[PDB]
Design an enzyme around this catalytic site. Structure first.
Site, short mmCIF file in Angstrom:
data_model
loop_
_atom_site.label_atom_id
_atom_site.label_comp_id
_atom_site.label_asym_id
_atom_site.label_seq_id
_atom_site.Cartn_x
_atom_site.Cartn_y
_atom_site.Cartn_z
N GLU A 89 7.33 -38.27 18.70
CA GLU A 89 7.62 -39.06 17.50
C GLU A 89 9.03 -39.66 17.61
OE1 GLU A 89 8.18 -37.93 12.79
OE2 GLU A 89 8.18 -36.25 14.20
N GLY A 127 15.04 -31.51 15.26
CA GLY A 127 14.71 -32.75 15.96
C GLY A 127 13.31 -33.27 15.64
N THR A 128 12.95 -34.38 16.28
CA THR A 128 11.65 -35.01 16.07
C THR A 128 10.58 -34.22 16.80
OG1 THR A 128 11.58 -36.49 18.01
CG2 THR A 128 12.85 -37.25 16.09
N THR A 129 9.32 -34.41 16.42
CA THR A 129 8.23 -33.67 17.04
C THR A 129 7.88 -34.25 18.40
OG1 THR A 129 7.33 -33.41 14.79
CG2 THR A 129 6.00 -32.55 16.61
N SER A 157 12.75 -32.22 22.23
CA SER A 157 13.18 -32.38 20.85
C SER A 157 14.52 -31.69 20.66
CB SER A 157 12.16 -31.76 19.90
OG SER A 157 10.88 -32.33 20.09
#
Lengths: 195, 231, 250, 235, 244, 241, 111, 240, 243
Positions: free
Chosen positions: I46, I29-31, I74
């Site tokens: 993010e 996943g995204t940070t 995330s």
């Protein structure tokens, strides 16, 4: 429904049941048969609250007809009357109890004896030579206590019944429009079509 | 492979194959486009028939006077999800005398789809949805995927060959976003976008389904002769 | 959640074996030896307190358990399975007997109840059988003294004397030689202690041996006086000291 | 094994697809929709000549204005018909009117995806639902165990279907009379049926606005078979 | 989820047999032999205990023969624990019938209900069936003396003489040979023992490896007595028929 | 072999899921130790904070179950907290129903029974934890009762749990063979804590700072955990002897 | 003892013309001898050219009208925007009312 | 509740558990039904691996559902008892509520409905039973004969057979049964029924059972000797 | 083997592979991060701009629980929402019975026990998220991070997603180079920086920054989003630090 009588003679059981059906102020019918054949040699008459009487009678009839098919065999009058007692005793502590009183008249083909069972809505069962429900016994029991014999013929039973019905017609306030009489013996159930 | 027998299993790379297989049903589905200005939002959908004796499957469903969607994939699943929306819109009206915000409709749809991806015996939904609506904060377009992911966009497309329409909209962005006060121009632009996803076929009178909702316009569907204007 | 294992985990293999019951009997075979002997005026049940660490206080672990004042039980197999069966056995003695008849169940019927529970774990959904065999010794007015074995299958048998677990085969042969129908209770204790020495490796004393009897009524253990017909429990666990007195007399 | 509501990697429900195979094995059913009525016909396919063919009930009344024909595991259709009839009568009770053919069809199709670990498997039978209502006139629908339904001017289902469908693609036009439609159903059945079509091993029906849904007598269908052989001998 | 570990106890083989029923019957074929013989004036139940130990308490023991009511008993072949579950059910059904109709339950009706219970375990619920076959010996006033058997399939049939458990093939042949219709109880007792004598897997047949019972008109006038034989009585009848 | 995945018997009469749960027990690589004084019960456990980003104060495997009972856990934290919450709920319910404080050994038995059920019922997995319960019981005095994933429990004179439990166990066994008594014959809990830390150092052969440990003490009518600086005071006294 | 019913008064009147219909009602809302409101509308436009008033206990009257309007909304969803005929509306309202046969909407309804 | 979908579709579109239930019927003892001009006869094989049986008490193969309808079967005996019980219960409920006994077609449809239900319900297997249901509607004299099977499909038959070697006896009936003129008498019908079983049965001993159902609740089982007289008469005619 | 095909099964090592497989989806996943400051906490994440068509500012990822708790995660976004919904029920029921708003440590365990519950059975799948959350209670500020295993601890700073190692490194620097504390506004800026720096590991697509905070002084102990002027200021700060 009002008057229902039973008498057990030598070799048969006789049930007499009033023909009137009253909805408060008017007599709606004068030819009502307050009886159901449970098996070829067992008859049940009934009286009590409107609707519940027939609903109960037909329910019992279905159960006994079901039993007859499953076992290919006819339950004894004692057995049928015990089943019926249990169902009423079950019902008396229900949410809405059956207000129904019954007489069960059967000929036991095994013992070759006629048998008469009296059961009230509480499930109070009693085997009797003669019986009634409600106010019927109050007028008729003194005649039956006098004239009844264990060895009476079917026609002697009918004559004693004729007398019982006459006392009812004399002293009862209600016009119950006569009785239908039915005989239960070794050959099954038949109706006396003139009374 | 060994990890795709049910929705309750992760692959060793952390993927959910039953969900990804559900996503595949969308891709075989017929194309549909959504886009909006600041005053209106439009759905265009290419209806697929079974053969020349059959009707063309309906692809757009009204949820409330101010909300509706188009579907791509398993149609009975869209019926189930759209019905759920009809109720949620309704509950918001009856109880709070409030029209349900498009953003909330998205959150509720996300949460409903999600539960079918975490439990045994269930299956993910096999349909994607484009939800348009006009509410207290203006016009909105949403993209629902049965993974649970709901996304708010200016425009998009889903179904077979939806990639063509998606880039057209990516180019047209600054143009169609400006189409305020002209319903017929926003539709025209939507029909042009869905046309990037055609091949072998083109738009006919019983092929094309358009829906519109906006500032002073109840959500309404156009089918049949009523779309000839745009062919 | 919910238990979604509503199907049997014990089923018949083509040869007609019930695999999980056999495997449970195997877990019993690995278990420490325990035994019981029936005398004319008592029953004795006994076993080894195989302590896991010497830092463990092994009197805090009861292998021999009172079920009713006249019924005791011992086991071979998995201790935790035994502990819960004893909890259930004690409760079922009350719920399905004492709360109905105002008296404790007779040995055979309490055994019948424990057996039922064990049978159900052999057929019910989502469970394995119990990994224990029980020996249950007790007394009641109309049957006198009795000793019963209960297996993972739920089957139970009455014994004059028997042993279960590790060294059962040798122990049963030992008991066949010494058992007769004229043993007084002290004689049976003595035999139990002799039989048990065979299967015990290390220390053998009142602290490594657990042993109880079903014998005379103990009015001194009742806790109150003044009801002539309450005469006290027949179940009695022998003390560490009591055992050692009989090991010099050995 | 593998869940009953499992998706294939291509994005289809295994059990729905497999049910479609059982439908391919079923006896043929054909429907043609006209502005004069909708005709429904089926191949009876008695498995032995001792079976009394008129006891084969593959065309069925739902309401006075709706009938339907089945193909596939026909035992599975009994409860679908029951639900359909209940839905039609219930709606009339609630609304003092006839229920729309589409609404009825949609109600039947809602049943279809109610399976899982609700019934244990999808239905193994497809239905041609035909009727009349005031808003949309004469209508034919094909209701599958997928839960999808399609409106058709004409449609065939069962073992002889894509052969018969190709034929319907050619022969259907928007001006067919009821009488023409009847002959067409008979003709196309005769083509794809294994044995020789007669009044005993095939059956006809129609729904018209005036007289409602009717199953045709064997005498009546026999006459239409005669009429059909004469038409074809005549060029 | 959990489907992975489900044996599916209630399915047909491709041949159309019920796997678990067949395998339970296989289990039952290794059980101590039980025999029932029906005579004009009574019924015999004889059954072999599984190979005993000298330390087993025999007189206070029951493994094979159980009283259902005063007029009906059963012989067990299979898992004892499984059988007791069913026996208590049967005992309760007998009392419900007596309470309802104020008449003792006809033998077949009791047999049918127990068989119907077994049947259920083969069709629904995903549980293993009961590893038990019964021989029912009973009397009622409609059919008189009756013998029945039921097995894990829930099928039941009636018999003049029958065996269940081990070596039934051998035992059924021996019964078929010497059984005659006008036979009496005392003859039937002898036949039952003689048959077990020849079919046993043990070296010889002793009192301590047996359970024995009779149902007789042998009471005072039109009534019926159940006799579960004490160990001594089996020892005496063994000597009396000259088997020891 | 599906007899490996759920709690049913293997052909040798074993429960592999139970055995593998015992292996999860050591996943944290922490060792713990419990001893009894005259008046108290002490439990010490290693404390390891690898990440500099962690808030060290929130890292603990010691739990205050009730006013009187303390529990140290050997195993992963999620199963530890699951067990702690349950034990807290069980101790409070017991107090309400029966009108006195739940004894250490009874709570241990109760949790042991709950664990037993997971060894018998298929849908529930065992917890990958060993639970050491400590108190000064009002009837029994200082008490240590320890639970494992098999549903086994017993009382202890002293005990240790973790990867290097065997070293600690024998170290303690050797002390009690010498002193010939059931407990640490020491007046103040401060000195019993010092004994506990001392004998952990000897057996592990490692030196501890104030943040490498975690200490719990049970006295009559309260169980409490020491702060970094209470432990520091303890380490200093050990060094000067 | 709690009484779940009240009486908000009001009077309504409906007349069927040859090719029109009127539904009239006063706008006064009362409890006992007090006026709650001199203008509280009581006759409503329900869509599909149907007007409705549920007079008596206003809480029950409002609940019923709300439910009927909602019934019209779902009739459109479920039957392809078909117009709800007045006879069909009437039958639907019977089922709404009789659904509370044993705890009635204390209103006299006219459409 | 135990929930497993045991009856499921296979890739070829077959439901194997339903089909494997038919294999259980295949193995069941043969049953045949022939309808005459004013009667129906139901014949049944009994496997002769069993002497020392008590035939007084052993469940007979033809069962009365009501006093005017009977049901016989091939397949699992225990399964059939469940269908028979339900059918009898429904017959009495029909009388209680409609005030008329069941038509044979109604009773058949109920039983077939039960069988079908067990092919798409979780946690149950299908019935390993096919049935022949025969009798006369109330106040009607046209004979009725129906068949059901594990899938739940049912239909009417001039004459029909099920169970082991049913192909053989169906072959026989297909050549020996003229629709235009059905067995005009009881004798004629019972004869044809017996003949068709003798193509498969073995001995004419107690292997054959026959039940005759006439209109208006007249049903009777034939006994050994009466059947034996039919057996005899057929062999003495064929030796030619 | 076969131990990794069913949740709640212990492998012979003693691990639950299905939980470990869930972690892979988290790492994918995204940070997203959390920084604990002097009197509060800051959350940042993010958001990958998949397309120009994503309406900016309008797919909000950070979620409030009650009035004082912030949650970010995330991995699988729907799984995160499902967890936040449960968190909101837990907080409502605590407030309902006890009146006071739920303390942060108490709230962490509620999520902890719920997530751990999804590792006890094969009939459910573990949560496909790591969740960073916290806020201000009567005892001050708390920051927590919670994994798919149900494991959680308190943090000085925390990160998760594809850029988690980059962020972890950056967080350790702040902790070392501010050992007496970090102000709320400082933390907001640093959060912007760290997300920008951690965006290297996700560089194909450019992104949208999203920040929130609860601070006793700056937001009254309530959770608020960082919008407009304060957001733009921190965007700038970060943009200057990558050059």
């Amino acid at each position: 429904m009002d008057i229902i009588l039973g008498i057990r003679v030598q070799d048969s059981v006789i049930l007499a049941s009033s023909k009137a059906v009253t909805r408060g102020i008017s007599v709606l019918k004068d030819s009502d048969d307050k009886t159901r054949q449970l098996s070829p040699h067992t008859l049940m008459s009934f009286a009590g609250e409107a609707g519940d009487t027939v609903q109960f009678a037909e329910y019992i009839q279905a159960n006994i007809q079901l039993y007859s098919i499953r076992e290919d065999y006819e339950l004894s009058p004692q057995a049928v009357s015990s089943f019926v007692r249990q169902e009423l005793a079950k019902s008396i502590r229900s949410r809405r109890p059956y207000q129904v009183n019954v007489l069960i008249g059967g000929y036991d083909k095994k013992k070759n004896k006629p048998e008469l069972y009296q059961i009230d809505y509480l499930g109070t069962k009693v085997e009797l030579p003669y019986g009634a429900h409600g106010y019927s016994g109050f007028y008729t029991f003194s005649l039956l206590d006098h004239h009844y014999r264990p060895d009476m013929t079917t026609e002697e039973g009918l004559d004693l019944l004729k007398l019982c019905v006459q006392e009812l017609e004399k002293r009862m306030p209600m016009d119950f429009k006569g009785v239908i009489v039915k005989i239960v013996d070794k050959d099954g159930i038949r109706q006396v079509d003139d009374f | 492979n060994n990890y795709d027998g049910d929705t309750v299993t992760f692959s060793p790379t952390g993927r959910l194959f039953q969900v990804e297989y559900a996503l595949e049903a969308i891709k075989q589905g017929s194309v549909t486009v959504g886009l909006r200005s600041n005053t209106h939002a439009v759905l265009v959908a290419l209806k697929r028939n079974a053969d020349e004796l059959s009707s063309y499957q309906k692809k757009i469903i009204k949820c409330d006077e101010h909300m509706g969607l188009s579907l791509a994939g398993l149609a009975p699943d869209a019926r189930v999800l759209s019905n759920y929306l009809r109720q949620q819109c309704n509950y918001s009206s009856l109880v709070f005398n409030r029209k349900l915000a498009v953003e909330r409709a998205g959150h509720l749809l996300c949460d409903k789809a999600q539960k079918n991806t975490q439990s045994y015996g269930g299956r993910p939904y096999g349909v994607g949805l484009l939800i348009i609506g006009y509410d207290k904060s203006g016009a909105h377009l949403l993209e629902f995927q049965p993974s649970g992911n709901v996304t708010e966009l200016y425009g998009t497309a889903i179904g077979a060959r939806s990639q063509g329409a998606k880039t057209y909209l990516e180019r047209t962005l600054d143009t169609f976003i400006k189409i305020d006060g002209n319903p017929d121009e926003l539709i025209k632009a939507g029909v042009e976008a869905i046309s990037q996803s055609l091949r072998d076929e083109s738009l006919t009178v019983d092929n094309l389904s358009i829906a519109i909702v906006g500032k002073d316009t109840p959500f309404t569907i156009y089918d049949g002769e009523a779309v000839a204007k745009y062919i | 959640m919910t238990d979604r294992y509503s199907f049997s985990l014990t089923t018949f293999s083509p040869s007609g074996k019930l695999g999980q019951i056999d495997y449970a009997l195997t877990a019993v075979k690995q278990g420490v030896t325990s035994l019981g002997i029936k005398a004319t005026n008592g029953v004795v049940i006994a076993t080894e307190k195989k302590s896991s660490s010497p830092l463990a206080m092994s009197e805090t672990l009861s292998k021999v358990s009172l079920l009713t004042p006249d019924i005791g039980a011992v086991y071979s197999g998995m201790g935790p399975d035994y502990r819960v069966l004893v909890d259930k056995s004690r409760k079922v003695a009350h719920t399905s007997y004492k709360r109905i008849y105002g008296e404790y169940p007779p040995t055979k019927l309490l055994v019948s109840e424990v057996a039922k529970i064990m049978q159900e774990a052999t057929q019910s959904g989502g469970v394995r059988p119990f990994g224990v065999s029980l020996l249950i010794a007790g007394h009641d007015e109309f049957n006198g003294f009795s000793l019963y074995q209960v297996d993972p299958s739920g089957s139970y048998f009455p014994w004059k004397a028997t042993a279960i677990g590790k060294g059962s085969v040798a122990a049963k042969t030992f008991l066949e030689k010494r058992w007769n129908d004229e043993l007084e209770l002290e004689d049976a204790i003595h035999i139990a202690l002799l039989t048990l020495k065979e299967s015990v490796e290390g220390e053998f004393n009142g602290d490594t041996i657990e042993l109880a009897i079903i014998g005379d009524e103990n009015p001194d253990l009742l806790g109150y006086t003044g009801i002539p017909t309450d005469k006290g429990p027949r179940f009695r666990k022998l003390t560490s000291q009591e055992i050692n007195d009989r090991l010099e007399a050995l | 094994d593998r869940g009953v509501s499992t998706f294939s990697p291509e994005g289809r429900l295994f059990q729905v697809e497999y049910s479609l195979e059982a439908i391919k094995l079923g006896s043929t059913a054909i429907g043609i929709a006209t502005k004069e009525g909708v005709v429904l016909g089926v191949e009876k396919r008695a498995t032995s000549p001792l079976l009394e063919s008129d006891s084969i009930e593959k065309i069925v009344e739902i309401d006075r204005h709706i009938g339907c024909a089945m193909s596939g595991l026909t035992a599975d259709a009994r409860s679908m018909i029951e639900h359909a009839r209940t839905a039609a009568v219930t709606h009339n009770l609630y609304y003092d009117e006839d229920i729309n053919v589409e609404s009825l069809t949609q109600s039947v199709c809602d049943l279809a995806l109610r399976f899982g670990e609700l019934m244990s498997r999808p239905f193994g039978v497809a239905l041609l639902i035909a009727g009349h209502d005031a808003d949309d006139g004469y209508q034919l629908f094909h209701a599958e165990p997928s839960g999808t339904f399609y409106r058709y001017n004409a449609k065939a289902i069962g073992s002889g279907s894509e052969g018969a469908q190709a034929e319907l693609l050619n022969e259907w036009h928007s001006s067919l009379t009821l009488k023409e439609a009847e002959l067409l159903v008979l003709k196309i059945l005769k083509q794809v049926m294994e044995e020789k079509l007669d009044e005993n091993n095939a059956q006809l029906s129609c729904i018209t606005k005036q007289d409602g849904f009717k199953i045709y007598d064997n005498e009546k269908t026999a006459e239409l078979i005669k009429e059909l052989k004469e038409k074809e001998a005549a060029e | 989820g959990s489907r992975r570990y489900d044996s599916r106890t209630t399915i047909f083989s491709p041949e159309g047999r019920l796997y678990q029923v067949e395998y339970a019957l296989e289990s039952i074929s290794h059980a101590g032999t039980a025999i029932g013989i029906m005579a004009s004036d009574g019924i015999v139940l004889a059954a072999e205990r599984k190979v005993t130990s000298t330390l087993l308490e025999q007189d206070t023991s029951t493994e094979k023969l159980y009283k259902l009511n005063d007029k009906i008993a059963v012989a067990v072949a299979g898992l004892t624990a499984d059988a007791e579950i069913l026996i208590n059910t049967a005992r309760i059904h007998a009392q419900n019938y007596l309470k309802t109709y104020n008449e003792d339950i006809p033998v077949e009706i009791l047999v049918r209900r127990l068989s119907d219970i077994k049947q259920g375990y083969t069709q629904h619920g995903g549980l293993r069936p009961f590893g038990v076959s019964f021989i029912y010996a009973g009397y009622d006033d409609r059919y008189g003396y009756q013998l029945y058997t039921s097995n894990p399939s829930g099928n039941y049939t009636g018999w003049k003489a029958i065996s269940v458990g081990a070596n039934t093939s051998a035992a059924q042949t021996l019964l078929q040979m010497d059984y005659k219709d006008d036979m009496k109880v005392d003859d039937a007792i002898e036949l039952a023992l003689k048959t077990l004598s020849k079919t046993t897997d043990s070296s010889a047949l002793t009192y301590d490896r047996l359970e024995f019972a009779t149902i007789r008109k042998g009471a005072n006038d039109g009534e019926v007595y159940q006799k579960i034989f004490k160990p001594q009585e089996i020892k005496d009848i063994l000597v009396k028929t000259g088997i020891t | 072999g599906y007899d490996r995945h759920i709690t049913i018997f293997s052909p040798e009469g074993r429960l592999y899921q139970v055995e593998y749960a015992f292996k999860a027990t050591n996943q944290t690589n922490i060792n713990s130790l419990a001893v009894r004084g005259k008046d108290c019960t002490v439990v010490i456990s290693q404390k390891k904070v690898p990440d500099k980003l962690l808030d060290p104060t929130t890292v603990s495997y010691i739990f205050c179950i009730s006013r009187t009972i303390g529990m140290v856990v050997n195993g992963p934290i999620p199963d530890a907290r699951n067990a702690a919450l349950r034990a807290k709920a069980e101790a409070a319910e017991f107090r309400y129903k029966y009108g006195y404080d739940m004894p250490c050994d009874v709570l241990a038995k109760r949790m042991a029974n709950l664990s037993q059920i997971y060894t018998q019922r298929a849908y529930m997995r065992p917890l990958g934890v060993i639970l050491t319960f400590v108190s000064v019981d009002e009837e029994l005095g200082p008490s240590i009762y320890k639970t494992d994933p098999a549903g086994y429990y017993v009382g202890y004179k002293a005990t240790a749990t973790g990867p290097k439990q065997q070293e600690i166990t024998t170290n303690l066994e050797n002390h009690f063979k010498k002193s010939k008594i059931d407990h640490i014959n020491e007046e103040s809990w401060e000195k019993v804590v010092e004994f506990a830390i001392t004998h952990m150092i000897d057996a592990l052969g490692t030196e501890f700072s104030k943040n490498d440990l975690e200490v719990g003490v049970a006295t009559k009518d309260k169980f409490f955990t020491l702060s970094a600086e209470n432990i520091e005071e303890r380490l200093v006294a050990i060094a000067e002897q | 003892q709690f009484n779940p019913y009240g009486d908000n008064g009001g009077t309504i009147l409906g007349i069927a013309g040859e090719d029109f219909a009127v539904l009239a009602g006063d706008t006064r809302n009362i409890t006992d001898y007090s006026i709650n409101s001199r203008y509280e509308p009581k006759v409503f436009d329900c869509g599909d050219n149907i007007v409705m008033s549920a007079n008596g206990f206003a809480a029950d009257g409002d609940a019923l009208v709300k439910r009927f309007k909602n019934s019209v909304k779902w009739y459109h969803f479920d039957h392809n925007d078909k117009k709800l005929s007045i006879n069909s509306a009437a039958r639907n309202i019977q089922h709404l009312l009789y659904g509370k046969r044993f705890f009635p909407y204390y209103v006299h309804t006219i459409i | 509740g135990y929930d497993r979908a045991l009856s499921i579709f296979s890739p070829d579109g077959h439901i194997f558990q339903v089909e494997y239930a038919l294999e259980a019927v295949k193995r069941g003892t043969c049953a045949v039904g022939v309808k005459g001009k004013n009667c129906v006869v139901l014949g049944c094989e009994r496997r002769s691996t069993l002497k020392l049986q008590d035939t007084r008490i052993t469940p007979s193969k033809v069962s009365k559902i009501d006093s005017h309808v009977v049901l016989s079967f091939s397949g699992l005996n225990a399964d059939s008892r469940i269908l028979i019980e339900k059918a009898r219960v429904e017959a009495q409920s029909h009388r209680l509520t409609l005030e008329d006994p069941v038509t044979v077609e109604y009773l058949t449809r109920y039983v077939a409905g039960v069988q079908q239900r067990y092919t798409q319900s979780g946690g149950v297997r299908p019935f390993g039973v096919s049935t022949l249901i025969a009798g006369f509607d109330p106040r009607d004299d046209e004979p009725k004969l129906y068949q059901t099977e594990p899938s739940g499909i049912y239909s009417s038959w001039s004459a029909q057979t099920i169970g082991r070697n049913s192909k053989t006896v169906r072959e026989f009936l297909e050549k020996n049964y003229d629709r235009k003129e059905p067995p005009a008498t009881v004798e004629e019908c019972v004869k044809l029924t017996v003949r068709s079983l003798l193509e498969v049965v073995q001995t004419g001993a107690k292997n054959i059972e026959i039940t005759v159902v006439k209109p208006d609740s007249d049903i009777v089982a034939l006994s050994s000797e009466e059947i034996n007289q039919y057996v005899t008469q057929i062999e003495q005619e064929k030796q030619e | 083997t076969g131990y990794d095909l069913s949740n709640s099964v212990f492998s012979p090592d003693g691990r639950n592979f299905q939980v470990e497989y869930a972690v892979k989806a988290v790492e994918n996943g995204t940070t997203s991060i959390g920084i604990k400051c002097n009197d509060g906490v800051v959350f940042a994440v993010e958001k990958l701009i998949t397309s120009k068509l994503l309406v900016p500012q309008k797919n909000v990822k950070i979620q409030v629980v009650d009035r004082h708790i912030g949650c970010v995660y995330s991995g699988l976004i729907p799984d995160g929402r499902h967890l936040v919904n449960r968190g909101r029920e837990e907080a409502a029921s605590f407030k309902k019975l006890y009146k006071t708003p739920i303390p942060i440590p108490a709230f962490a365990d509620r999520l902890g026990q719920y997530v751990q519950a999804h590792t006890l059975y094969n009939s459910v799948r573990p949560f496909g998220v790591s969740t960073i959350f916290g806020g201000v209670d009567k005892n001050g500020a708390h920051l927590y991070m919670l994994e798919p295993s149900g494991s959680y601890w308190g943090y000085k700073g925390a990160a998760t997603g594809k850029g988690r190692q980059s962020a972890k490194a950056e967080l350790e620097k702040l902790v070392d180079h501010h050992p007496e504390g970090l102000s709320a506004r400082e933390a907001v800026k640093q959060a912007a920086k760290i997300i920008y720096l951690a965006h290297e590991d996700n560089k194909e697509k450019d992104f949208e920054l999203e920040i929130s905070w609860c601070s006793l002084s700056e937001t009254n102990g309530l959770h608020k989003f960082v919008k407009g002027d304060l957001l733009q200021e921190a965007i700038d700060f970060a943009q200057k630090e990558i050059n």
